[model samples]
Target: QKTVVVTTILESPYVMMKKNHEMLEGNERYEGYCVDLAAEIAKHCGFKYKLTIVGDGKYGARDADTKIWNGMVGELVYGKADIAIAPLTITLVREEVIDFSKPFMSLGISIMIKKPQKSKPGVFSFLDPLAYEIWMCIVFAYIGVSVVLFLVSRFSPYSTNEFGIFNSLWFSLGAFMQQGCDISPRSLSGRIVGGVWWFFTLIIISSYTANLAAFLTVERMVSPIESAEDLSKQTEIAYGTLDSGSTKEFFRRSKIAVFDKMWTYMRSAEPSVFVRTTAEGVARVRKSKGKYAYLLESTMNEYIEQRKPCDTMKVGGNLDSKGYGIATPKGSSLGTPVNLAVLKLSEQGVLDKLKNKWWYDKGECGAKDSGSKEKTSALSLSNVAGVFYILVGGLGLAMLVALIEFCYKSRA
Candidate 1:
């Protein structure tokens, strides 16, 4: 019996050793989407096969310095393997060196980020709706309006002799608080300043009220990067893809400005952003404390996002659309049969069934609802504890002042 030699990698949910692999021999030792896919392809193509892992454990890239092929692509190029049945992405560079069967699965490059943490509510959270500069401007406006009213009232005959700086300040504060004051502005300039301040306060209060409602009701998740553009625009969060993988090649050859910039950063970044494997990149992201992002295929990204401990999430849509296809040496007779079998399996929905079995069927995390709303927690006393502390401190200081005044008056 002629046996076809197949080469693959141990990528999660794609090509993985079975739990009982140590006891099992031959093909039964492995199980995954790609493992099942390879079996179906072999059955349909009427070929006996032997499975082997790539010696170098790399996806393959031609080195710029050495110009030597490594990994699964090298195995295929050098005639070490008859076929590659793995989650090998199809790329123009790889296609030029080796032939690929019709894509078995479609995907795109995406960002894997840690799930955003809910913003912590502070004691002065009520002031968050407005900018600090705006708050400062409001304070200055209040003082300015009061001072202007005092000056204008002194020159106007309509103003009463009792009008003073304190009275003017009291009138301004009362107007701003929406309370009517007994002391009315009698001068024309005083009334004009008061009317304008009233209008300004009305707009400011309305805006603050609306923004405060949103802040309290909507749960805000604080994420550093929103898209690929954001990742390229900042330096705080470092990002990289699998070393020597199709994703790395995509960035190296890309002409897009944002992607070009990102590639430059990855290439020159200290400590090296490029990870040797997807697992390494995932581990780096987990330990980096949200300071790093892993760039990988959306298929893997979605799978991890649904796995146990669910700390990671896929951010934004994919950067580019592509697919993973089986690889064969150029002019190999196996390409046509494999391509046809893949198309048949995809059309028959076998591919989707395989994916569900491996990726989600035994998932540790329960099924999540796509439309479920995030829970909003009401503000707790701990959130505003500082405010109460300030109040008590002020009361204590006032009492101390009163005691000193009493002692002084009694001595006198």
Candidate 2:
């Protein structure tokens, strides 16, 4: 039997260099989903083979300037290898220059966003609507305003001596609720002080009431995120795809308004936003700490999602559905038997076995059972953060006014 040349890549689970690869030679140097699948494909076709990694460590892409192909597909076009099978995708342009078997595996290209972080819920979580800082300010402002009104009563004869500290406190509290108090002073210095306190109370109260609706709405909206259109609409989470994979080409070639806009932003994304390697792309997402979303194949993300750290998960159905196939140079005589054999293996559920073998059984992080739970663009702490700043500053300014009123009474 003539020896066949199979070109694969060094990717995890798919085709990885064995731990003792340095001591091994030829096909034995590697082991992975693709390695095992390759063995079966060859076994059916009855041929001996050697597995080779492409000269350039890329999947395949047409050169922007030269229009020539490179990577695994390039190896086939140049006859450097016979069968290029890794997690090689079934793409439109690739099928023209090379022959792909009836997609041994079908998978989706989906969104990979960081696991949503967790935050708050308490008994008085009701107070969560306001920061503890505002709570403190509310308490302190009330005391300070009452102290100012009581101080004004001590010296200013125009103010009532009956406006004691307790009375002044009750009077201010009543104005806050807009309920007329029995202790309300007769008019002038002490009464004028109540006037401004009532004004301040209603302003803060109405502002607080206004935001309560939005906060509840945010909680409501948070219930829905889970689409490409959703991702495209938001700028908070920056998403990207592999530079060397078919994903970029999908976006680049897409005419759909949503995807075309996505390509526009993705291509222009702050330079070098497109990653070169699969692990590099996945790594960037892990390191990004939830700021980035990686658009990748289902198998790739599934592998990562089940592994340790378990910090990322898939979102949406998929950018689009496609398959991973065993590819060979176009017009190669080797097509007929391999194509027939791939289907024969498929009919026996051997493909599913291969997936379960590498994808689930070898799972380093355990269970492959993912339940559907995924996010809507609800307001986050950061989005609602400035409201707290305004609250703090306004209270600070009001407290200054009370301090001035206290000293003005002392001078009188």
Candidate 3:
């Protein structure tokens, strides 16, 4: 039985050396997402295979001056490998030189930035529990409610007209703090208005304190760059992608405004923004202290972000859409069968299962937990806006009731 010689790479979580690789032999020496993908494809296509890591350790790119191809793509072109199974991105230019099976996995170019420093709590951080607009509205609420109290008290014959602006302000303030005030509303209408205002204060204060508790536990984080647009605008932060990968080539060949500008900078920048491998690029990001960013495919970026000492974050939308495919030599018959197997595995959710196993299950860091903050949500302007409407609406009704009460008492 002849075996298919598969040439791949040693990319982390894709194809990595097992702990006891020196003791092991053959395919048992390595395992990862791509390795697992190769197994399933082989099972479906009924092929026995021998796995070998590519020598140059690159995905592939053709040299302009030499007019020669290199990396896994080159392995196939030179007939050195029967199949190139790895995170081999399918591109228009590469497709012209070699045949590719359907994309085994979809991905896009993403930015990997080091997680920024947590902001220290400030002196006036207590005010941060509520937004600016909400605080302003509270002051407005107090003044308006005070006006209602004054009118209702003055209108009713049963109560004295002592609930003026300053007095009512004091009364509402004391009630909001749950402290009893010296002044009390005697009129029934004024009492109703005060009761409603107290209720509103209760809800607002509780919401604030609850949110404040979260702020006490959680620290604020700030990042200067949020998107590619921001990345293109700044020169302070040095950014680069793998030198020989499709991502770098993407920028070089693109006409989009931001892409072209970034391409120019990376091509001409001093100290060489480009890296030989994704591993070097990531370690550079970790060491840069928010000074350097790595532009890489989302797959490897995501895997690294989920790993131990998770200091990296995937930033911004992916620049462009693409996929990783199994490559065969030109005019090779393996493309059709391999592409069908990929399609089957993808639809059957086997690929998704493999992704979760390698990406999440083995994660040393709290990959998903760190990303999603399940903390108390600070109230927004829209969240608590309704209380203002009810307070104002009820205060207006209280004024109307006082007017009607005054008119009735006089008529009797």
Candidate 4:
């Protein structure tokens, strides 16, 4: 029995341990996009094969200091495995050492971030739609309008009662609050000021009311990083790609200033930003609590974002375009047949079917558009608790003053 040996890596949705893998033997122990892909290729080429995980668990990168290839690429290059079937990215350097089948799946390096945490509603969050300067300007405008009204009332014949500064202030505040006051401005100048202030208050109040509804109903998530440019421009969030994967390679070799700066930061980052595997990187991202981000192929990023307990998301468009291909030792007879098999499968849409099966069809998360839509939480008592506190405090002060007033009345 001639069994072709296929080497693959244990990457999620690419190659993963089958649920009942312990009970299943040989090739049945594992299943995923690549597993099904390998089976299809073998069946099409009329070959029997056994799948094995690559030793040292890497995706193939040559160490600069050691001048040695490692991971699945090493396995194929050294002829230890008959064929390398994994999410192996096709690169010029690797192609020099091993022949690759035409890419079966296209992808690019992308960012994977922990889903933006829903913003906690603050008691004063209702004020967020307007700028702080705008709020301050409104306060100043109220005081200025009140002062102007006081001056205009003194010179105008429309004032029926004494025009004191306190009276002026009270009238302005009452009008701003939409509550009519006993004092009315009858003089031409006073009435003009009143009309202008009324118009200003109307506009301001209407704007605030409209904005308040949106702020309260539509939830917001504050994502610190939106794109690679954002990441490169910030120092608060630490980010890195798989330690030796093509994503890391892309950054390390990129001449673009943004990526170069990011690579520099990752290399020199304290506590080390790099992780040994995509899972390790993802785990780091989850545990970092918004402080860390992982960079990997967009395919895996999207697949994981759609899976159960969907806590992560793809943060921006891909940085660069590339593809994953099956690898064979250079000149191996399997290369041509495997390439033809991949092309035929792709043409027949089997590749798309297989991807849909592994990535989306079995997804545990329901169809709610998990990654893009904002997750809103109902406003709770805790969110608006401060407002109640202020109200209670104001009532207590009013009651204290009332007690003093009653004591004064008794003394009189």
Most accurate candidate by lDDT: 1
**Candidate models: Cα lDDT each:** 0.83, 0.79, 0.82, 0.82
> Which candidate, 2 or 4, has the higher lDDT?
4
lDDT of 4 by residue, 370-397 (tens): 5466555666786667788889999999
| Root-mean-square deviation of every model | 5.9, 9.7, 11.4, 5.2
Off by more than 4 A, model 3 = 64-67, 123-227, 230-245, 258-293, 367-412
lDDT of 1 by residue, 1-412 (tens): 7989989998787777878888899989987777788789889999999989888988988899988899999998888999999878787889899998887787888899887775555767656789999999989988998888888878785824766988888888888888898967666776898789889879988998899788777665667777889987888888888877567878999999988998888888898887776789899888877888998888878898778677798888889988888898999988798888888998899988988887777676646643364666666786778788889999999999999999999999
Q: Any residue pairs clashing in model 2, and if so which? A: 225-375, 225-376
Best by TM-score: 4
Q: How accurate is candidate 3 locally (lDDT)?
A: 0.82
Weakest 10 consecutive residues, lDDT, candidate 4?
Answer: 366-375
Candidate 3 per-residue lDDT, tens place, 293-343, comes to 988878878888888788888888888888878888878878788878888
Angstrom error of the Cα, residue 287, model 3: value is 5.3
True-structure lDDT of candidate 2: 0.79
Candidate that beats the other on lDDT, 1 or 4, i.e. the better one:
1
**lDDT of model 2 at residue 11?**
80
For all predicted structures, in order, the TM-scores are: 0.70, 0.61, 0.64, 0.77
lDDT string, candidate 2, 115-229, tens digits: 7665444324445567889889988988999999888787775633787877877887888787887765665877778778878888887877888778765543242248888
- The weakest ten consecutive residues by lDDT in model 2 span 216-225
The superposed Cα distance between candidate 4 and the true structure at residue 323, in angstroms, equals 2.8
Q: Can you list the residue pairs that collide in candidate 4?
A: none
